[PDB]
Amino acid sequence: GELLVATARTQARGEVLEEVRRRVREALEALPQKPEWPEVVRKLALEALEALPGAKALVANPEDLPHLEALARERGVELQAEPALRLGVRAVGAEGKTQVENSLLARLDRAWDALSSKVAQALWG
Amino acid sequence: LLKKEYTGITYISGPLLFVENAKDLAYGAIVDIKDGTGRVRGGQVIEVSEEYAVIQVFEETTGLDLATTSVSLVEDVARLGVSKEMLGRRFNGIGKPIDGLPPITPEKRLPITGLPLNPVARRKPEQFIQTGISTIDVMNTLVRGQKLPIFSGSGLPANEIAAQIARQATVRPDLSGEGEKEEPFAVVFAAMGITQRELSYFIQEFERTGALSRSVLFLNKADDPTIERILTPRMALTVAEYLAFEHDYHVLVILTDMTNYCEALREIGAAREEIPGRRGYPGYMYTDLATIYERAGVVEGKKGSVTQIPILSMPDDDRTHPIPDLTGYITEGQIQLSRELHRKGIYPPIDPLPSLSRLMNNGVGKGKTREDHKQVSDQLYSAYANGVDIRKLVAIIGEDALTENDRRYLQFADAFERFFINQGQQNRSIEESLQIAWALLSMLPQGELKRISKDHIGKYYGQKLEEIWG
Amino acid sequence: EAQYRERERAETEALLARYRERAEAEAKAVREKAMARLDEAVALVLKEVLP
Amino acid sequence: MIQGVIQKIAGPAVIAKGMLGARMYDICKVGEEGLVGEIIRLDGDTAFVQVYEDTSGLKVGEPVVSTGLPLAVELGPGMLNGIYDGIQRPLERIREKTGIYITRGVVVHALDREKKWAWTPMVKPGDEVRGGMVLGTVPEFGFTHKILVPPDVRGRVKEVKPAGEYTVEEPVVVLEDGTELKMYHTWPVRRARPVQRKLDPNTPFLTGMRILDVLFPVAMGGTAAIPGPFGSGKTVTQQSLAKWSNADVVVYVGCGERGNEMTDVLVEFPELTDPKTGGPLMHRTVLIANTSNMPVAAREASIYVGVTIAEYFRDQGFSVALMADSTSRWAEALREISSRLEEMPAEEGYPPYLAARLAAFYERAGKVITLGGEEGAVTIVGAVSPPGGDMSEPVTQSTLRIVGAFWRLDASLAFRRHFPAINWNGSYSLFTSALDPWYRENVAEDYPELRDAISELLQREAGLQEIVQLVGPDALQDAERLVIEVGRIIREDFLQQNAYHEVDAYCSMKKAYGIMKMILAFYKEAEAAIKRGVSIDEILQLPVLERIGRARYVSEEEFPAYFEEAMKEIQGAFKALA
Amino acid sequence: MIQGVIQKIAGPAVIAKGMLGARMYDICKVGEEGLVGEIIRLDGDTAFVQVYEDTSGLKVGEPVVSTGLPLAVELGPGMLNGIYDGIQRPLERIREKTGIYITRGVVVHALDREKKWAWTPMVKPGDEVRGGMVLGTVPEFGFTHKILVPPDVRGRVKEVKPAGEYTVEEPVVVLEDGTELKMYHTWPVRRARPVQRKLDPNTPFLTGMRILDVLFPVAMGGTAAIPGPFGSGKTVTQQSLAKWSNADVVVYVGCGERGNEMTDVLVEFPELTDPKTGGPLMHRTVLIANTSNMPVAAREASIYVGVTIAEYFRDQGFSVALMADSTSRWAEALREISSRLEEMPAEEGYPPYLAARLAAFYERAGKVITLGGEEGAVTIVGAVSPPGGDMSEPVTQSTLRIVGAFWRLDASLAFRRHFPAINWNGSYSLFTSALDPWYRENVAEDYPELRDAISELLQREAGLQEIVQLVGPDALQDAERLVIEVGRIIREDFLQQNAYHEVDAYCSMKKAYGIMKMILAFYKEAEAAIKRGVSIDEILQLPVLERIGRARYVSEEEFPAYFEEAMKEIQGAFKALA
Ligand SMILES: Nc1ncnc2c1ncn2[C@@H]1O[C@H](COP(=O)(O)OP(=O)(O)O)[C@@H](O)[C@H]1O
Ligand SMILES: Nc1ncnc2c1ncn2[C@@H]1O[C@H](COP(=O)(O)OP(=O)(O)O)[C@@H](O)[C@H]1O
Ligand SMILES: [Mg+2]
């Protein structure tokens, strides 16, 4: 019975953390319909191009194509647009065998460990 | 952070693959591998250079082609997400849970290889444990903080002995003189290549004694991939060190079948063309077994403890093989099972001669269990070794040509094997075991008992076997 | 033996029912505690994900 | 589709260039004849094909064509009463196609695509099907071959073709995804077929012998291993397991051993009769042959084909018995391809992953409940052939850690023509503690204690025989000689079985229990009569000792009327004793 | 200095490039954390570096900064009552800085830079100093730690700081040139310290254990080697030598062994009392501790730091013991690092320079007269751990050549708890002819004849062992049976010694001389009494055997008052016997 109540409590906590994950998923899904989207695209694209030493090309959205246009015609970087990459940018570095993706859902998936470790003690402490 | 993919795998064979143009991968880093079907395998980086990099792959190597299968980076050093609400859960070899419950919320991220413990910041393993087994209580005493494995064969019941120790090990607080609380044991159960029958026995034993609310299991079945066996004991002992030294539990670690771990590292060390030690096992197997075993014991000023019981399957049931030999060089003591006593019908089949607890002298004696204990142990060993080496003399001159006291040793031997070793599933405390040892020592007169002092032999001698039970 | 068998059945059922009820109460209580406390943390994760 | 050419040929190794994007462990048609090989060691733009056929006469530049699918068996109706080779093509269709010799690279379909099978559906249109769920049934021989959804297919049934008769490639259930479900399906042999839950084995695998079910039993989901040098049985015991068992179907996979055994099984099975449903014995055996003169890289695949077929008949509700014959020859095949691939050996040439491959083979046996709800089991008996006797081998000590029953054969005990040559002092079982309630409800009530008395008599005689070889039969006291005589009656009545006699080839649990009661009644009532003043040289020459000794030659129907009269004779031939 | 970048990381091995101008066996700061490494195999413009911590999280491109010096110890006041790791970092300071886990990249000084010392000088301004000459004097735990001119330092003293309290950094002697001489100096670990002359050894190293000091002795300038299997008695013997021997200082080198058996030495040595003084036992020991889970490349450094610290205390006039356990772990560490060098090995896998390393290690002992004129000694007791239990290994049969005083531990005497498990048949000592006049002067005059008679009785026992194991303990005559029973009483009452009883852990050789004199008096008078004719097994039932048996338990204070009574009881019991 003690194992039953402990599994009940942890399985109740899991769906709460999952729906908070869904809320931040919709928060950064309905985010490009907002004028701070070119600013955040320029910021994360410059972070991807600087964390990749000497890139060659960049892959983005067509709608996200002009918003880094000032960074397009400097650094000597090729540009390309794809609709599959709905979020974030991609940087192909100097040969085609090294690639840096900077999607928003990707950043959520990378940082969600320490994010959840702070979220649980934030909303349960 | 940001996704860092590496295309350009040059070579894939066995457990290894090579990725070129890979400089931001660190040594010891963790990579994951995505093929064209979305299946994400894991792997660890084990050689880095400006030309290429070498990855050991933690799963099967089916469907990995070279035109695809990007290699991405995660956890620049290999870590494990550890928590305190981890004590009713099951995990696979990498640490992903297989119980239906959601993954845990990590309270820390500890490095999975584990740093070595400072010899100044240790503490003597001191406190007597009792395991209800008369051999491991009177003759080869386990104490809290010790690393003692069970050296066994192939048909021998080492798993039943480990489960019996796990279900009846209790410290004795009243004989020790530290008061009383009866703090029970958390159990960390790492298992590497348990088939289905051993796993069924262990989980039925744990759920029958009510221990799966105190235990955490890192399971690795026989058909699971044979490279995650390298990470299984290290992430078991990461959780054990966490629970003992940052929450002050009393963790007992059952490390099943270390011979499968050693053959897994033989596989990954023969994939890399490395010069071996003895019988094909690589030269650094001493260092790997040391970095696993030596992560146990007690520290100073802190309430915790990591006690270790590994289990070894000796291949040709000999002490000479590199796996049990190097194991016995790192660890402190062994409990060695004998096939010679198992065919006679004796459980637990422990012959006391090759088995030895090293630091028994820190947990026995006056004011800890009882003042006669070490001398009783020495006299039991002397008299039973006389019985064992007089059986050969009986075998080469026949039965009737014996002096008296030689038949008395020959009767001490089988009375020992049929009454002191041979018990059932019964839990016998240290007083029943000491009075059965004294009742067997009463079969020999004074003057042969030249290792027990005179006050002990004056106040304990003189009880037969018809008074220790009926 | 019949007496202790029926006593085992009655006591085990009467204790397991209270365990089920305490489990349901604990799950509903932790959900209602977590729901009103929410939307503080979504700003935290949305601030730390974004550059 | 990837089509490259050959770069290098060395034995069965074909290093092929131009293979870029070729997945590992695929099946590729190497050579312009259509040779079957499997891709390992990707290196740059270059594969490494182990071919599963002969490899002579290939030139450099011939096309290798990768198919992009792993090694997969066809699983459906048309398999029982079947002989296959190591890549599942039937040998009888080959000899009716080619000749009496096994030529190189002939393509046939593993199932018969002109056999007309009677369909009877069990899924009405509109239902939802998961993996492993039964769609319908086919009457095969005397069995009921239920066909089932592949384990990676989930959907809703759009249409069902009605209850007629069809070919195995006729799409009988079209799901509402476009997916047609046929009567057969292909499955990769290195992937274990999934289950719902693995149970615990609690019902013995009745081998029909007397030393391999009484003293050392294997349960229904158990694993067993038979070592032993040459001339020590090891083939008649495997064929006795294949003949006289309680298993529903038998997959007899023989890799690396001689072909006279294969033609012996093919000749003398259709004349016999299994004692379960009647009809021929061959209508439940699927036998896979890879003879030692046949190619050597294919006996690796033979084992996986055999255990996948056993798992297929396990996933329907049966109780399969797989006899895997000379897995040491499979270890030699792995040694061959490992040394051809330039790998480091470990302990006499075998690759370091040998124990891992061997554990992944023996782990597939088990007592499970399938995905269709029904329960099934598959047991594995692996004959291992260590070279010089010498049980310290890598293959033997690697298979010894995982199996649950170890049946050691001797060479000193098969030179007295004491068959079966199982060493009763050195073999062991681990299913004895689990099969005790089945014994107490299905053979006797005091059956485990009678067995333990037999075992301790054998242990006592074994300990006593060395001082007999010291001093002779003189200085034995009086009971020291009666232990020897009862032990010899045991090892010449109970622990000895002909398998060529008509009636002493099968032995149910009742007949072995009756012989055990006769032996222990003789010992119990003669040791109590040896202390009322009877010579040991009188107790042996009774006419009832022959009635014990020939008790293993009576039928299963004559035996209870023989047993109660023999108990009357044993109880009455000691009352007149003086 | 010599800047390079990391090119390749594989295990505890870093290839750097751009290091052109670096020398062999230097020290490198590898990485941004500043890990300590050592250059072996420089080629082209690269350098292979073995790192003395673990590399995990390093990556290519990180800089390597060379130093230009080999590995050097700091030698000065402040090493007694101290524990260091393999590169001489004091571990108590590391526990103060870090927590309970030993981290990498931490930097501490070996000697305390904050502790004051009580300098009193011996040189005056206007003196001539050569290397090894004393300068002053500092107290250290009662020890008179005298401060030496470093070797290869010659000059004339300009000024000397007056007597007072000073730190170790303060230049206490400024020479006529610009040279200043602090209280410490660094010294490499592969250049053995210079010396004036090497004496021949004529004074035993008193262990305290009876067998290792009577039958197989060690001179004060001699080496000794104790091999044996696991569980035989190596580490308990070496802690007994660390606990009871007559060394002025003791250097204990844990080279790749347990941490619990260094925690034992840290905890229970301050509770004890050093003989020859009154201060505690921890105040005379230095403790180098490179345990098993510490990084493997530091074990060579750990085995050299101990021998150069022992040479430093030799150069002050002390008599140093060096207990180095597990030189085979240093051999295994060399094997693991030679695997990264992709070299070709000798037998068993070890690199071929192993016995040159062992000869250069064991040759650094041996009773010298130092550069300062006064005499000192280092005596090295080395534990060898044979891998298979067999003493037929490239380490064991190399130390077996280059050592005297070999002490072989068998497992058969350790299965039965007969400690110490010294195999008498496989042990020797080459010093029994050099310690003879010291025995005749400082033990008794008839001591070595008594020792040789003990040795020939053990030889006669080991000669009769063939016959008594073939035929039996009976069918001997009475003299041979008396020899076998006297051999039993020697092995149980003189050789056996448990190292946990209060009395009988230490044994002066007056006491061992008394025990041997009693056993020989018993043997010769029983032999004379059995030639004229008395029964055997009434001499085995005499009550003086209790006196000879308990003779090793009585204290050394009342040992003459026990010895005279026991000897008179021997003659009286044999006189009243007839
Ligand atoms: N000389 C001795 N006196 C008393 N007990 C001993 C002695 N030598 C060994 N023992 C017992 O056996 C154990 C042997 O340990 P140790 O010698 O360290 O093994 P190894 O030498 O293989 O490292 C000790 O812990 C102790 O219990
Ligand atoms: N086929 C292989 N691929 C990659 N590495 C290998 C292969 N065969 C051997 N090795 C490893 O390469 C290492 C060679 O060491 P080396 O390159 O000289 O210096 P470092 O160890 O610093 O890289 C050996 O440790 C060996 O284990
Ligand atoms: Mg040791």
UniProtKB/Swiss-Prot annotation, chain A:
Top-level lineage group: Bacteria
Range of residues in the leader sequence: none
Entry's transmembrane regions: none
Any one of the GO CC terms: proton-transporting two-sector ATPase complex, catalytic domain
Keyword Zinc-finger: no
Entry keyword Aminoacyl-tRNA synthetase: no
Gene Ontology MF terms in the entry: ATP binding; proton-transporting ATP synthase activity, rotational mechanism; proton-transporting ATPase activity, rotational mechanism
GO BP term, example: proton motive force-driven plasma membrane ATP synthesis
Keywords tagged on the record: ATP synthesis, Hydrogen ion transport, Ion transport, Transport
Similarity-based family: Belongs to the V-ATPase E subunit family.
Physiological role: Produces ATP from ADP in the presence of a proton gradient across the membrane.
Name listed for the protein in its UniProt record: V-type ATP synthase subunit E
Organism: Thermus thermophilus (strain ATCC 27634 / DSM 579 / HB8)
Gene transcribed to yield this protein: atpE
Residues of the full protein shown: 64 to 188 of 188
Swiss-Prot record, chain B:
Listed CDD domains: ATP-synt_V_A-type_beta_C, ATP-synt_V_A-type_beta_N, V_A-ATPase_B
Highest taxon, organism lineage: Bacteria
One Gene Ontology term from the biological process aspect of the record: proton motive force-driven plasma membrane ATP synthesis
Coiled coil regions, renumbered to chain: none
GO molecular function: ATP binding; proton-transporting ATP synthase activity, rotational mechanism
PROSITE patterns: ATPASE_ALPHA_BETA (PS00152)
Keywords, sorted A to Z: ATP synthesis, Hydrogen ion transport, Ion transport, Transport
Keyword Ion transport belongs to the record: yes
InterPro entries documented for this protein: ATP-synt_VA_C, ATPase_a/bsu_AS, ATPase_F1/V1/A1_a/bsu_N, ATPase_F1/V1/A1_a/bsu_nucl-bd, P-loop_NTPase, V-ATPase_su_B/beta
Family: Belongs to the ATPase alpha/beta chains family.
Protein name, entry field: V-type ATP synthase beta chain
Native species: Thermus thermophilus (strain ATCC 27634 / DSM 579 / HB8)
Curated annotation (Swiss-Prot), chains D, E:
Pfam assignment, any one: ATP-synt_VA_C
Record Gene3D superfamilies: 2.40.30.20, 2.40.50.100, Bovine Mitochondrial F1-atpase, Atp Synthase Beta Chain, Chain D, domain 3 (1.10.1140.10), P-loop containing nucleotide triphosphate hydrolases (3.40.50.300)
Listed GO MF terms: ATP binding; proton-transporting ATP synthase activity, rotational mechanism; proton-transporting ATPase activity, rotational mechanism
Swiss-Prot/TrEMBL catalytic activity: ATP + H2O + 4 H(+)(in) = ADP + phosphate + 5 H(+)(out)
Protein biosynthesis recorded as keyword: no
GO biological process, one term: proton motive force-driven plasma membrane ATP synthesis
InterPro entries documented for this protein: ATP-synt_VA_C, ATP-synth_a_Xtn, ATP_synth_asu-like_sf, ATPase_a/bsu_AS, ATPase_F1/V1/A1_a/bsu_N, ATPase_F1/V1/A1_a/bsu_N_sf, ATPase_F1/V1/A1_a/bsu_nucl-bd, ATPase_F1/V1_b/a_C
Protein family per UniProt: Belongs to the ATPase alpha/beta chains family.
The protein, known as: V-type ATP synthase alpha chain
Organism: Thermus thermophilus (strain ATCC 27634 / DSM 579 / HB8)
